[PDB]
Amino acid sequence: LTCVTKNTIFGITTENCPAGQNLCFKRWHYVIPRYTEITRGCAATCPIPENYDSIHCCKTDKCNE
């Protein structure tokens, strides 16, 4: 739903998403020891963790933070 989409310096954006992709997923893909990219978005239930990467799945509103 209306969860965090862009989280970085210069503001944190919380937005909604169209119906059918209500739940919020927060996927952590680790590039090097000192860089762990986070992708926060919407999904129907939750997407799949390819390459064995941690992905938290949330059904409530504003859970990814």
Binding site: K6, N7, T8, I9, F10, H29, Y30, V31, I32, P33, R34, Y35, T36, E37, Y52
Partner: protein, 260 residues
């Protein structure tokens, strides 16, 4: 087969780095055109810092090949802190050499005796202390995997206090030196040393610039291609090996010492 290729490439990089830096240290501590002058101690220490930076490369290599951390949380913290410390120490060492040159070029008006070893060793100790205290406090303030518990503030602080600020300081220092020289035939030892150092600064900047630039970009919020970013991350470790080549190409007596 990819894992073996990467392991072999990183091992050759480590071997070349260690060999070049050991040769540089020996050359600085031997002969007469290198041991007698005192400014070569800064070069020897930069070589030593690059040399000890080969306990960081193998662990990043192991992380890449295995795909997960295999050393524990405490060693993960130590590895992060020391990995930041080594690059920060190298760049601040370049800054310290530039600042010493700027101070010397503006002090000869008031005369100076031969107390240079004390000043050189004082700068040696001071730059290591500054590199430690400009990198550790930000780190301590902020299935196994070695992570950075970041709020997107450590990236900006690390890049500012490791790359951008010393770069601006050195730009200002060398602009001042150029202006002073402009206000005030054969080449001298000091001219050769300054040229070699300037080439080293250029190599360091062109090597470490892409990684810190895209690191700042990731802090700002722009995504980065993963393979390109990893290549940029390893290209600084490549710089570590490249530096002794810069010493041995553009300064002849270093080459003679290496041959001996």
């Amino acid at each position: 087969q990819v894992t073996l290729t990467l392991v072999c490439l990183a091992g050759l990089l480590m071997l070349l780095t260690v060999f070049g830096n050991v040769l540089v240290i020996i050359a600085v501590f031997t002969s007469r055109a290198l041991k007698a002058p005192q400014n070569l101690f800064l070069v020897s220490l930069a070589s030593a810092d690059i040399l000890v930076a080969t306990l960081v490369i193998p662990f990043s290599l192991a992380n890449e090949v295995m795909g997960y951390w295999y050393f524990g949380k405490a060693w993960c913290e130590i590895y992060l802190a020391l990995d930041v410390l080594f690059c920060t120490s190298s760049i601040v060492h370049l800054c310290a050499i530039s600042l010493d040159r700027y101070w010397s070029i503006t002090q000869a008006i008031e005369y100076n005796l031969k107390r240079t070893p004390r000043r050189i060793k004082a700068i040696i100790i001071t730059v290591w202390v500054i590199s430690a205290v400009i990198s550790f406090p930000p780190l301590i303030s902020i299935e196994p995997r070695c992570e950075i518990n970041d709020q997107k503030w450590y990236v900006i602080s690390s890049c500012i206090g490791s790359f951008f600020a010393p770069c601006l300081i050195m730009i200002l220092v060398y602009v001042r030196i150029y202006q002073i020289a402009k206000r005030r035939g054969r080449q001298n030892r000091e001219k050769r040393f300054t040229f070699v150092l300037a080439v080293v600064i250029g190599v360091f900047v062109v090597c470490w610039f892409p990684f810190f630039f895209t690191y700042t970009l990731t802090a700002v919020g722009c995504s980065v291609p993963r393979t390109l970013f990893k290549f940029f991350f390893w290209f600084g470790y490549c710089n570590s090996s490249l530096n002794p080549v810069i010493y041995t190409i553009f300064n002849h007596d270093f080459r003679r010492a290496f041959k001996k």
